[PDB]
């Protein structure tokens, strides 16, 4: 009961990207009620492994932070997207091409051109101007927010409980912004 708890699994928010408040795992339980002593000490020996795998997974994978389910993620702790700088091939450098038309030759069609020998091409940055904050994606929620195994559950002062397990709770208001 208190010692081998069925772990609190989270729920994903697709819109905000935050954690949608966790819930007790109620869809993987064995029905050990029809079992004598040689198996109900084996079933409890199984849950005591997934409550130890989930603690040796929470250290390898999750970011060490204070506020689990934070409302506003920082910039550096969110996966960014930095592709290669987009190498743009400029076709015809017009520093000597506008002289060709002013000589009288109208151009058409379209090295790269025969009248000019040179061909410059520029590169430019392909990332965003500012990195992204406020909300993690789906694969970040695959990575972080492993099911939190909560031992000796709800055993303390008010406010000392995990208040974000309530799937209605604002993390920076100490309150449900309810119907108003």
């Amino acid at each position: 009961s208190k010692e081998i708890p069925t772990p609190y699994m989270w729920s994903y928010q697709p819109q905000m990207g935050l954690a949608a408040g966790a819930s007790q795992d109620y869809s993987s339980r064995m029905n050990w009620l029809s079992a004598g002593p040689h198996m109900i000490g084996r079933v409890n020996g199984i849950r005591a492994t997934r409550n130890q795998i989930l603690l040796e997974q929470a250290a390898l994978t999750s970011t060490p932070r204070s506020q689990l389910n934070p409302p506003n993620w920082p910039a550096v702790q969110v996966y960014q997207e930095n592709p290669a700088p987009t190498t743009v091939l400029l076709p015809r450098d017009a520093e000597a091409e506008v002289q060709m038309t002013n000589s009288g030759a109208q151009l058409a069609g379209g090295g790269r051109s025969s009248f000019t020998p040179r061909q410059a091409y520029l590169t430019l940055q392909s990332s965003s101007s500012q990195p992204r904050s406020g909300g993690i994606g789906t694969l970040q929620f695959v990575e972080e927010f492993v099911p939190s195994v909560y031992f000796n559950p709800f055993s303390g002062a008010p406010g000392l409980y995990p208040d974000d397990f309530i799937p209605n709770y604002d993390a920076v208001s100490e309150s449900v912004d309810g119907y108003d």
Partner: protein
């Protein structure tokens, strides 16, 4: 297990948390539904005569 109303269906939508539509990421010819029976007109998606 002997059913006889198998033909009375149209669009079947499956959406997790009401915002990720599940055919996958726009995997079909309409990104938010499984079209059982396009009755009316329009494209010629109708196969199997």
């Amino acid at each position: 297990g002997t059913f006889y109303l198998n033909h009375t269906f149209k669009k079947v939508s499956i959406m997790f948390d009401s915002s990720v539509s599940w055919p996958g990421n726009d995997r079909l010819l309409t990104p938010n539904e499984f079209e059982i029976k396009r009755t009316v007109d329009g494209e010629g998606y109708n196969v199997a005569q």
